[PDB]
Ligand binder design. Sequence first.
Ligand SMILES: Cc1cccc(O)c1
Lengths: 30, 21
Amino acid sequence: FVNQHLCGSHLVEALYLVCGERGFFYTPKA
Amino acid sequence: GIVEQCCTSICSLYQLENYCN
Ligand SMILES: Cc1cccc(O)c1
């Protein structure tokens, strides 16, 4: 499950650029 | 489900804005 692991690394990075000054919370679930 | 939503199929910047604060 290195695959989801690889994928959330790129997702938090897209989130960092999309949320900007607002932030985001990163839940690997829900 | 961020993962299930975005790791199984590609997410657009626009769906991505929803996990912002
Ligand atoms: C922008 C981005 C990063 C990683 C996975 C995706 O579905 C979308």
